[PDB]
């Protein structure tokens, strides 16, 4: 039982609300506001089949009003990127399963 | 003789003026750094695990 009983397919099915943060470069108080908004927005726009474009459009509009005029966030199953951002303007957190989310302020 | 001290009084009036000063101010935005992040299914699963 426990970890041995658990399987990758089983783990994904068992928990869909688990939140994992891989890279943090933004102030913690700012991260708390951003994390609550992104999780709520993705679930609302997830629909029958998750849309990468749909999730980004909702996140981009919310972030621009929330902090600064030019805010760029990209979410993909797998990607390699080099990004130049302002100090404490980049937060990297990936959702449980094959979902990687990158949000930064330019 | 017609002009008299009581007959004509002269008063000097001036307006206070702040001294002109020259100051130089330079503004330069917060330093920005380049960040590269690669996300894979196994890496996401490992953090999740």
């Amino acid at each position: 039982k426990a970890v041995t009983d658990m399987d990758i397919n089983e783990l994904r099915k068992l928990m869909i609300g688990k939140a994992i943060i891989n890279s943090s470069d933004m102030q913690g108080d700012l991260l708390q506001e951003a994390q609550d908004v992104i999780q709520s927005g993705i679930e609302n726009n997830s629909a029958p089949v998750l849309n990468i474009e749909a999730a980004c459009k909702y996140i981009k509009e919310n972030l621009d009003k929330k902090f600064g005029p030019t805010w760029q966030c990209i979410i993909g199953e797998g990607y390699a990127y080099d990004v130049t951002v302002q100090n404490n303007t980049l937060l990297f957190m990936f959702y449980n399963g094959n979902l990687a989310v990158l949000i930064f302020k330019s | 003789t017609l002009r008299n001290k009581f007959n004509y009084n002269t008063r000097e009036c001036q307006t206070i003026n702040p001294s002109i000063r020259e100051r130089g101010v330079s503004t330069e935005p917060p330093p920005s750094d380049t960040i590269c992040g690669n996300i894979t299914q196994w890496e996401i699963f490992d953090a999740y695990y």
Side-chain angles (χ1 to χ4, degrees), chain A residues 18-83:
Chain A
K18 306 296 183 57
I20 185 181
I21 303 179
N22 171 12
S23 304
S24 179
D25 190 9
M26 201 171 73
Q27 300 174 346
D29 188 6
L30 306 180
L31 294 172
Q32 168 190 3
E33 307 170 347
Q35 286 169 46
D36 303 3
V37 167
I38 58 181
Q39 294 187 14
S40 178
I42 290 183
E43 297 171 343
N44 291 7
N45 69 44
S46 283
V49 173
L50 190 59
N51 305 323
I52 294 308
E53 170 282 339
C56 270
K57 169 179 293 296
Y58 170 113
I59 291 184
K60 162 61 165 178
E61 294 169 9
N62 284 223
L63 266 292
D64 279 6
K65 185 179 180 179
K66 216 78 166 188
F67 302 86
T70 181
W71 190 286
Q72 306 184 22
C73 73
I74 36 67
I75 79 175
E77 162 77 44
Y79 44 82
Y81 66 75
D82 289 345
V83 175

Side-chain angles (χ1 to χ4, degrees), chain A residues 38 42 74-75 79 91-95 99-103:
Chain A
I38 58 181
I42 290 183
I74 36 67
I75 79 175
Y79 44 82
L91 150 61
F92 180 113
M93 165 187 175
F94 39 65
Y95 196 83
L99 294 94
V101 176
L102 167 70
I103 68 180

Side-chain angles (χ1 to χ4, degrees), chain B:
Chain B
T1 299
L2 177 166
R3 294 186 181 181
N4 296 308
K5 201 69 174 184
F6 41 109
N7 178 11
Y8 274 123
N9 193 336
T10 53
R11 298 171 173 177
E12 36 213 16
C13 164
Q14 86 168 185
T15 62
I16 315 175
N17 289 160
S19 313
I20 74 75
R21 189 77 65 88
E22 54 189 14
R23 193 182 198 86
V25 174
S26 63
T27 58
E28 292 177 350
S32 300
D33 289 314
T34 169
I35 193 180
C36 302
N38 60 338
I39 200 57
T40 55
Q41 197 63 3
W42 60 271
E43 188 168 354
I44 294 178
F45 177 89
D46 183 348
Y48 197 81
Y49 187 100

